[PDB]
Amino acid sequence: LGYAIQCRITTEDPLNDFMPDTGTIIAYRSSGGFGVRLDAGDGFQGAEISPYYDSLLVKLSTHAISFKQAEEKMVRSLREMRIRGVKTNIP
Amino acid sequence: GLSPTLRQRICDAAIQLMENIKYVNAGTVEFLVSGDEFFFIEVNPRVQVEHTITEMVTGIDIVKTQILVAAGADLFGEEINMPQQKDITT
């Protein structure tokens, strides 16, 4: 039934060669919505981020009838996101 | 629990109505049921609070569509992407 898209929000700096950033999140807002599924990992207003594990802030999955639809759903959620005080792979 | 063809008739009734009066955008036909018959109650010409549930079993964003129909767009087109009637189920 329709199409879904998934991706992970990590602390890899797409400018820096995706070396995961460490340290402490100071602001975390997340989109939900119909069609959207969030599987939070280390993303929330308190978390201090250890260098020790595969970084993974939120598993983001979307799901609409047309692939293009689910693609927009994804983008908006990416955009609607808001993480602060560590660079993210989001852009 | 309701027989698989007793739903189809109720579904068909609704459609017969709105098809007769060229209904534009989402609406809901309320029926009252007993034994093996429907009786028409009302029409809510708009989204119902309970839309999500139907969207979850049919995979259509109802609200998103409302906007696109308004936009001038086509039911079975590139933008709404509605699947042919005999293709829509749950």
**A64 lies within 8 A of chain B by CB:** yes
With CA atoms as reference, report the closest residue to B88 among B72, B30, B80, B37.
Answer: B80
Residue type present at position B71: A
Burial track B1-15 (b if 16+ CB lie within 10 A, e otherwise): eeeeeeeeebeeebe
Q: Are B48 and B28 in contact (CB under 8 A)?
A: yes
DSSP, res B70? H
DSSP, res A19? P
Q: Are A63 and A2 in contact (CB under 8 A)?
A: yes
Is A1 in contact with B59 (Cβ distance < 8 A)? Answer: yes
| Structure-derived torsion over alpha carbons of residues B7, B9, B12, B18, reported in degrees to the nearest 10 | -90
Resolution of the experimental model in angstroms, please?
Answer: 2.8
B63: closest chain A residue by CA? A34
How far A36 CA lies from chain B's nearest CA (Å)?
12
Q: From which experimental method does this structure derive?
A: X-ray
Which of B18, B46, B70, B88 is the catalytic position?
A: B46
- Distance spanning both ends of chain B, measured CA to CA: 15
